[PDB]
Each structure stands twice: as structure tokens, then as C-alpha cells.
């Protein structure tokens, strides 16, 4: 075999400790660049003028941040959606002041994670597996796209994309509530049903299987040793678990089919989170949560507040305070 | 929720953060386990719809743990190899998450908040150019409190004249 | 109109309140809309000179139809709620409005997304079926069992 | 920054004590007769 053939055989080899593959060929350098830039920036980057008003925000550890407050800060509002790679700056100092690291990191990362998904398909194919784990992964991936790419496109600036940091994430969430009333949006509500529900069913499944483990051990050892990797026998009694759960609610609310059940386990959180992503991605074009402000009115016409109006008051506090020096005109239109 | 952000800075609370990690991690485990099982199924029937190729009474595993283990080992670096541990872990993560969040709320019962980082505030008070996402979010909180309190807390009879309401430029 | 010199008006941040420069120098509208300076439209272009928004044109040449058009567009921005309450998320009920641009963009993002998902689904499946393991792993011929261990 | 001066020893012991607990248990497990 020629050099290229050998190379292909290696790249796509099923025997590498970590699978490479052709998606991996793109994934590895992009994730490495995103990771390295992210770590260096988070430790040592100078303050970044996120909102383009010459008001630099400090994100790195060395410049006054801890783990909770620190961030790689989104690129300047002055840049908007312009492509700002290192070679567009006159100097690394300019690059840093304007939040170049953010763009380098999120582009390399979005590419790298997309290729991560593809790579999940690829290895499933090499191993003779069914292919749809990558489809489950598409949900968190779509979410990442929503907050790092789509929302900035819709709002016209990477300065409104989610910050790479913990407190920055909370900043993003609060401003989002102010500007879209995301809490009152049914896609976010489906997202909450998705992750609350995912958590619920995670605990439920775990507890049912654990509860019906077949006795294979003594009381002085872990029950885990009762399972051996690659044994052909199932390690728990699904009929017993179904008997239990079916009696807990009623029989036909419970799954007797393991495949059906595990399919449920995959579908609920994945679909819920798909809707979360789509919620962010469509509020990206300002189709917002339900607005029932002043919806109830008495016989004279007095406003009768509901809980929605109280929400509205909170949102107003967020709105009037956020980015306090950035607005010169009365409407915040993006 | 919004009250807890504005008054307690609840998102800053490490017990709530552990809660979030437990719920999001629970969701992740739900998704990834269900999808993994469904994609390492043995062909136990001739149907292209594969649900019928299961019998609750059957003795065999319906999917391949060995293939699953190699796949995740090569994709993510590590993988479950023990099923009992897998399912115990699935119990452990969301249950522990919710318990931690509970501890945090018990603290908020007494206004025992993780509201501030004292070092942050000392620096920012002395240095009008020092800005982080932490100080940004407190400005948001101050907005929430002042703008929501009079209607949200009617028993207090709050009257906040226009001139005292915190507001940035224009808005 | 009230007598402000909009070219020299310094805003609170030190950037122009009405007018500032783009990162490459063109004269552009100030405030947050600095992000949108790539916008081009028939009602704005007559005020545009070779270096961007032209101060003399701004001072002397703005027509009433332009004022009208800017007011109309400003007051019909593509912002609105799912039940079609026009405006920012904090606005009170009164105006029944969500932009067609919002409807079209959101609908087609949703559809494009689920169609990407569908592509992943049917591509993965078509591969698996063509290779012949779309229905599951052959117990007596499980491929991983014929591979060397990773360690 | 005016951080809490006990923060360092707090973090250090928080990490080291239980970590050391685990390392002790692990090593004496390995050394048990295979």
C-alpha cells in the first residue's frame, strides 16, 4: 500500500485508543486551538470593550477575577458581525482590547464540536453500530450554536453572544429575560420539561434498575461486583422492576419493553432540549415570549395585575439597568 | 425565580450551581444512556422497526455493553464498563443535585446568601474603572429590586418617586 | 431641529451621541446601532457621502419623506411577542404586530434545523442499511469482539 | 485584591485531606495479594 492508503487506514483505524477519523482530522486542531486560546485568555487576557463604548470589562484571573466572575469576554459591539481574526488587528494589543480571543475560540469550538458530532457517526459506522447517538448529541450542540452564533446573527453582533464564563452566562440569561421574556416562551418551557424531565427519568431508571439487581454478592462487598463486563445475562430483573413501577402508578403507565423504555429515555430530554435551542434561535429574531401585560381589565378599565405583570416589572428593572451607558435613544431595538 | 435573582443573587450560589450540575447532568445521562442502548442493540429480530425484538422474560442483554464501552472509550476517553455502577450513578447525580439546591434554599430562608464577593466590592468601590460580569449582574439585581418591589410587595406601601429609580442612559 | 450640532455632540461614553466612526473610519450612526452600520437603504443613502454619513447633507438635505420613513421603520421594528403584541418584551398590550421578517426567519430556522436533524438521521441510517447493520449487531458476529483491546 | 487570608489554607486542606484519604485507600488496595 502507498503512503496515502496507509495514512487513511491509520486515520480510520478502529484500534486507536482515541478514534481519529476524517471528522477527527478537523476536530483535533480546531478544539486544540480553541482550548489553548481559551485557557491563556481566561488566565491572562486584558479587559475587553464588549459593548463598543470604550468601557473595558475585565474577564481574566490575573486582572481581578476569580473562577466564578471570570470570563473570556465577547468581541466589541463596534465589530458587530464582522470577521475579526488576529491578522485584521494592527497589533495583538488592539486584538485583545477588542475581544478577538472570543471570536477565535467560539469559531474554532463550533467547528470542532460539529466535527465531534460527525465523528460520533463515523465511529458508530466503523464499529458496526446503529448511527443515532450523534443525533442525541445534536441537542446540546444546537444549543451551543444558538447562544454563540445564531443569537449574535439575529441581533447583529457577537457582543450579544453568550460570554465564556460563569457570571457572564448569568448576565446573558438575565438580559435575555429582559429582552425576550424567555420564561413565558413555550419553547423554553419545553426545554425545562426536557431537563427537569430528563433528571426525573434519570433518577427513576437508575433507581428501578438498582432496585431490581439480582443477588450475586455478599453484604460485605459492593453489589457492583455482581456484574461482570461483557456477561451475556442481564444483571437485573426487568419483570420485577416493571411489576414495581406498574404497581406504583398503574400497569399500563409502565414500560415492559426495555428498548421502548430506553428510546423514551433518549427522546424526552433530546426533544425538549431541541426546543430549548429553537427557542433561543427564534428569539434570535425577536419572536418573543407571551406578553400578557395589562391583559386583565375591570369594568371601568382599571388594570388588574396578574403574576405576568409582576414578571413585567422585574424585566423592566433588568432592561433599564443593563449596559447602562450604551443606549442614547429610548428604544433598545437590538 | 426572578425575585430570587434580584434579591438573593441565587445564580451565584454554589449550592444552586451544584443543583444545576445535577439536573443538567441527569438530563445528559438520561439522553446518552437511552441513545447508547438504542444504538448498540443486538439484531434480535428481522424487523426494521426494532422494538418488537425484545421479550421482558428474556435472559440476555438486549444491547452490547462491550461495543458501547469501546465506542465511548474511543469517543470520549472513558466509558462505563459496569452496568450496576452505571444505573446507580444515574440515581446519584440528579438526587444529589436536588439535595444541594435544597441546602442553598435553606440558607436563603435566613437571607444567608452568596450575594457578594467582598474583594470584588472593595476593589470596585475604590476603582471606578474596574468592571466584571459580577458587578454588571449586581446592577441588574438593583434594577429588579427597585422596579418590582412596590407591586410585588404591596404590604410595604412602597412609593419610589421617579427620580430615585435606578436607570441607565435613555432607557 | 431643536438646534443641536449633531456632528460635534459628545455622548456620555465619549463617543458621538449621534455620529461616530466605524473601525475603518466611515461616519456612522452612534449609540448601540453602531453594530448595524453595514445597513443600506433607499431612505438613508441620499445622506451618504464617500466617507459615510455626510454632515453637510445631514444638516441641509434631509427631506420630510425621509423623516417619515425613519419614524415608520423605527416604530415597526421586527420585535414582538408570540401572541403578536408589538414592541419590546416589556411593552403593554395595544399594538397588534409581529413583523413578517420575524415570522419568516423564525419559521425557516426551525424547519432548517429539523431538516438538518433529518439529514443526520437518514444519512446515518442509509449508511447502516447499505452496510447491513441497521437492525442491530449480529450476536454471533459482533465486530468489536474480533478487534484487539484498546488496552 | 483584599481576599480572605484563610482562603488559601482552606482550599489547600479541602483538597489535600480527602485526596490523601483516597490515595491511602487506593494504594493499600493495590498492595493486597492479587
Amino acid at each position: 500500500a502507498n503512503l496515502w492508503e496507509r495514512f487513511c487506514n491509520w486515520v480510520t483505524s478502529t484500534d486507536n485508543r482515541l478514534y481519529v477519523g476524517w471528522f477527527g482530522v478537523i476536530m483535533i486542531p480546531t478544539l486544540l486551538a480553541a482550548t489553548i486560546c481559551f485557557v491563556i485568555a481566561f488566565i491572562a487576557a486584558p479587559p475587553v470593550d464588549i459593548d463598543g463604548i470604550r468601557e473595558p470589562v475585565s474577564g481574566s484571573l490575573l486582572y481581578g477575577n476569580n473562577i466564578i466572575t471570570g470570563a473570556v469576554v465577547p468581541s466589541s459591539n463596534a465589530i458587530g458581525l464582522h470577521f475579526y481574526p488576529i491578522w485584521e488587528a494592527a497589533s495583538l494589543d488592539e486584538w485583545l482590547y477588542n475581544g478577538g480571543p472570543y471570536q477565535l475560540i467560539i469559531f474554532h469550538f463550533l467547528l470542532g464540536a460539529s466535527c465531534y458530532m460527525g465523528r460520533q457517526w463515523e465511529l458508530s459506522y466503523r464499529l458496526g453500530m446503529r448511527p443515532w447517538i450523534c443525533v442525541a448529541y445534536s441537542a446540546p450542540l444546537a444549543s451551543a450554536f444558538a447562544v454563540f452564533l445564531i443569537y449574535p446573527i439575529g441581533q447583529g453582533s457577537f457582543s450579544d453572544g453568550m460570554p465564556l464564563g460563569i457570571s457572564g452566562t448569568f448576565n446573558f440569561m438575565i438580559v435575555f429575560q429582559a429582552e425576550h421574556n424567555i420564561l413565558m416562551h413555550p419553547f423554553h418551557q419545553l426545554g425545562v420539561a426536557g431537563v427537569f424531565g430528563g433528571a426525573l427519568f434519570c433518577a427513576m431508571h437508575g433507581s428501578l434498575v438498582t432496585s431490581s439487581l439480582i443477588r450475586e454478592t455478599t453484604e460485605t462487598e459492593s453489589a457492583n461486583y455482581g456484574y461482570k463486563f461483557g456477561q451475556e445475562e442481564e444483571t437485573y430483573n426487568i419483570v420485577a422492576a416493571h411489576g414495581y413501577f406498574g404497581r406504583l402508578i398503574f400497569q399500563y403507565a409502565s414500560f415492559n419493553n426495555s428498548r421502548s423504555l430506553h428510546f423514551f429515555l433518549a427522546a424526552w430530554p433530546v426533544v425538549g432540549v431541541w426546543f430549548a435551542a429553537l427557542g433561543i434561535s427564534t428569539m434570535a429574531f425577536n419572536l418573543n415570549g407571551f406578553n400578557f401585560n395589562h391583559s386583565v381589565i375591570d369594568a371601568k378599565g382599571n388594570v388588574i395585575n396578574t403574576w405576568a405583570d409582576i414578571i413585567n416589572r422585574a424585566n423592566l428593572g433588568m432592561e433599564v439597568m443593563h449596559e447602562r451607558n450604551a443606549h442614547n435613544f429610548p428604544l433598545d431595538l437590538a | 425565580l426572578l425575585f430570587f435573582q434580584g434579591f438573593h443573587n441565587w445564580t451565584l450560589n454554589p449550592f444552586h450551581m451544584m443543583g444545576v450540575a445535577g439536573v443538567l447532568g441527569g438530563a445528559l445521562l438520561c439522553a446518552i444512556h437511552g441513545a447508547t442502548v438504542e444504538n448498540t442493540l443486538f439484531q434480535d429480530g428481522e424487523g426494521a422497526s426494532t422494538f418488537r425484538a425484545f421479550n421482558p422474560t428474556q435472559a440476555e442483554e438486549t444491547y452490547s455493553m462491550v461495543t458501547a464501552n469501546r465506542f465511548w472509550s474511543q469517543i470520549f476517553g472513558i466509558a462505563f464498563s459496569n452496568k450496576r455502577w452505571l444505573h446507580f450513578f444515574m440515581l446519584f447525580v440528579p438526587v444529589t443535585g436536588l439535595w444541594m439546591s435544597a441546602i442553598g434554599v435553606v440558607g436563603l430562608a435566613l437571607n444567608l446568601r452568596s450575594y457578594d464577593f467582598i474583594s470584588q466590592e472593595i476593589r470596585a468601590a475604590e476603582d471606578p474603572e474596574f468592571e466584571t460580569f459580577y458587578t454588571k449582574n449586581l446592577l441588574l439585581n438593583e434594577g429588579i429590586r427597585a422596579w418590582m418591589a412596590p407591586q410585588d410587595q404591596p404590604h410595604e406601601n412602597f412609593v419610589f418617586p421617579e427620580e430615585v429609580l435606578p436607570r441607565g442612559n435613555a432607557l | 431641529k431643536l438646534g443641536a450640532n449633531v456632528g460635534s455632540a459628545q455622548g456620555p461614553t465619549g463617543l458621538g451621541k449621534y455620529l461616530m466612526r466605524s473601525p475603518t473610519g466611515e461616519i456612522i450612526f452612534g449609540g448601540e446601532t453602531m453594530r448595524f452600520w453595514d445597513f443600506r437603504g433607499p431612505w438613508l443613502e441620499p445622506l451618504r457621502g464617500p466617507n459615510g454619513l455626510d454632515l453637510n447633507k445631514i444638516k441641509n438635505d434631509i427631506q420630510p419623506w425621509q423623516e417619515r420613513r425613519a419614524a415608520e421603520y423605527m416604530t415597526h421594528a421586527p420585535l414582538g411577542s408570540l401572541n403578536s403584541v408589538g414592541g419590546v418584551a416589556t411593552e403593554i398590550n395595544s399594538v397588534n404586530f409581529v413583523s413578517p421578517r420575524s415570522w419568516l426567519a423564525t419559521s425557516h430556522f426551525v424547519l432548517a434545523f429539523f431538516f438538518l436533524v433529518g439529514h443526520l438521521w437518514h444519512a446515518g441510517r442509509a449508511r447502516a442499511a447499505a452496510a447491513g447493520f441497521e437492525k442491530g449487531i449480529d450476536r454471533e458476529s459482533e465486530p468489536v469482539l474480533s478487534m484487539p483491546s484498546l488496552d | 485584591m483584599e481576599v480572605n487570608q484563610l482562603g488559601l489554607i482552606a482550599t489547600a486542606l479541602f483538597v489535600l485531606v480527602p485526596s490523601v484519604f483516597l490515595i491511602i485507600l487506593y494504594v493499600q488496595t493495590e498492595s493486597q495479594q492479587k
Binding site: 485508543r17 485557557v39 488566565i43 484571573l61 490575573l62 476569580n66 473562577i67 461482570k228 463486563f229 461483557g230 456477561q231 | 462491550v66 464501552n69 472509550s73 476517553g77 472513558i78 466509558a79 464498563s81 | 483491546s149 484498546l150 488496552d151 | 485584591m1 481576599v3 482562603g7 488559601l8 482550599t11 489547600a12 483538597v15
Partner: peptide, 30 residues
């Protein structure tokens, strides 16, 4: 000291990733 502490814990975690992956107890079929 704070910064050193944060970066040190992070570094230990990355090293831990390395050992957990390349020096894991190998899964063995029975």
C-alpha cells in the same frame, strides 16, 4: 495566591483527565 490556586486546581484536573484515560484499569471481558 488566588490565581495560583485556581490555575493549580485546574492543572491537577487536566492531569487527572490524562491518567483516567490513558492509565485507566482496562475493561476485561469475562
Amino acid at each position: 495566591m488566588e490565581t495560583i490556586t485556581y490555575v493549580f486546581i485546574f492543572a491537577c484536573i487536566i492531569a487527572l483527565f490524562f491518567f483516567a484515560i490513558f492509565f485507566r484499569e482496562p475493561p476485561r471481558i469475562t
